[PDB]
Every structure is written in C-alpha cells, then in structure tokens.
Design a protein around this ligand. Structure first.
Ligand SMILES: Cc1cc2nc3c(=O)[nH]c(=O)nc-3n(C[C@H](O)[C@H](O)[C@H](O)COP(=O)(O)O)c2cc1C
Length: 191
C-alpha cells in the first residue's frame, strides 16, 4: 500500500477503498478504518478481493451494472445500491466509484466510498460548491471526472502548477483533508 494510497483514504471519515485495475478482477489494495466500522470487514478480509463481497441476494443488478460501466469507461458513478454488512444485515449503500491517479499522475486506480443512507447530501454538496469561485469550480469539475493535473491544465489553458495552486485553494476553502472527499462532493452535486 503506497503512502499516497493511505494518505488519500485514511484521511477521510467516509468509508473508502482503493482498487487496482492492473490486477486480475480489480481487487481492493486498501481500505480505511471507516469502511471497517461501516461493514465490519477488517482489512485483512478485504484486501486482495473484488469489492463485490458487499453484494448479496437483493443487490439490484442494474445498479451493479452501471458501476461496472463507470469502471470500464473510467467515469465516476454514484448509486444507492443494496449491500450487506459482515453480520449479514442488508443496508442501502450510497456508493461512489471513481477513477483516480497515483501521486506521480501516472497509473490509474479506482476510489470507492460508501455511505449508509440522500438528496440531503446532494443539497449539501451544492452549498459547498457555491462558496467556490467560478475558476475553482472549473478545476473541481475536471479533477472529479478523473483527469490528471496535466490533463486538467490542458483543458483550462493552464500550467500544472497553477491548477495545483487552485486545488489547494479549494481544499482549504472546503476544509477538506483528502481529494477522495472532494471527488464525492462534486459527483453528489452533479458538477
Ligand atoms: C473501488 C471499487 C469500489 C466498489 N464498491 C462497491 C460497493 O461498495 N458495493 C457494490 O455493490 N459494488 C462495489 N463495486 C463494484 C463491484 O465490484 C461490482 O459488483 C463488480 O465489479 C461486478 O461484478 P461482475 O460484473 O463480475 O459480476 C466497487 C468497485 C470498485 C472498483
């Protein structure tokens, strides 16, 4: 588990995981404490496994199916799917799954975040984004969609350092500690 992997998720209070698509079946390579407190699954019993172990009998296949669609298109997707905790108790999981890049902006990975639940988080995220300047929104929209800093820059007619500066600016504006969290807020708002 690279340092950045754990920097990215362990800093988030929301149940979060990271998978590696260059491993067969795109298994998880890390989870944070909140995931364990949500599901009851310890990391030893998650890492190396595809996150489908949260799926069960009532899991609506059409929702599972847009997740796999978002994974293969490399696009963020957010659904409220029926999952099952460790004790077997079913729960409504507002699950985000989004393409994310490592520290070197080289390799693609997948970030998942899970919250037990709705439109309230949506309205919330919308209020947070409303405090950002027009340019910070541009940057936020583009990062959330998966792109690299290099790529976001290319789309705004910017340098990679300027974008970095802007991100740091939104991270402190929104009082966030990890990018995982910013991603989820953008997708929640539809931005
Ligand atoms: C990072 C990540 C997190 C995921 N989290 C969940 C989840 O919390 N709940 C869920 O039902 N599926 C989640 N998925 C997708 C499941 O693995 C999905 O059921 C599986 O990819 C489809 O299995 P199949 O198409 O081989 O039948 C996640 C996928 C990724 C990449």
């Amino acid at each position: 588990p690279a340092q950045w992997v754990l920097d990215l998720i362990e800093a988030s209070p929301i149940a979060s995981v990271v998978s590696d698509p260059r491993l067969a079946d795109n298994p998880l390579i890390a989870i944070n404490q909140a995931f364990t407190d949500l599901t009851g699954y310890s990391e030893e019993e998650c890492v190396g496994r595809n996150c489908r172990f949260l799926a069960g009998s009532g899991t609506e296949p059409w929702l599972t199916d847009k997740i796999r669609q978002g994974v293969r298109e490399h696009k963020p997707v957010l659904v409220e799917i029926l999952n099952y905790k460790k004790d077997g108790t079913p729960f409504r999981n507002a699950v985000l799954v989004a393409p994310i890049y490592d520290d070197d902006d080289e390799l693609l990975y997948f970030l998942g975040s899970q919250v037990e639940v709705g439109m309230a988080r949506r309205e919330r995220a919308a209020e947070m984004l409303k405090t950002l300047s027009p340019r910070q929104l541009e940057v936020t929209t583009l990062v959330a969609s998966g792109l690299r800093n290099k790529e976001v820059a290319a789309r705004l007619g910017l340098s990679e350092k300027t974008v970095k500066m802007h991100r740091g600016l939104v991270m402190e504006k929104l009082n966030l500690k990890t990018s995982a969290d910013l991603v989820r807020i953008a997708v929640e708002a539809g931005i």
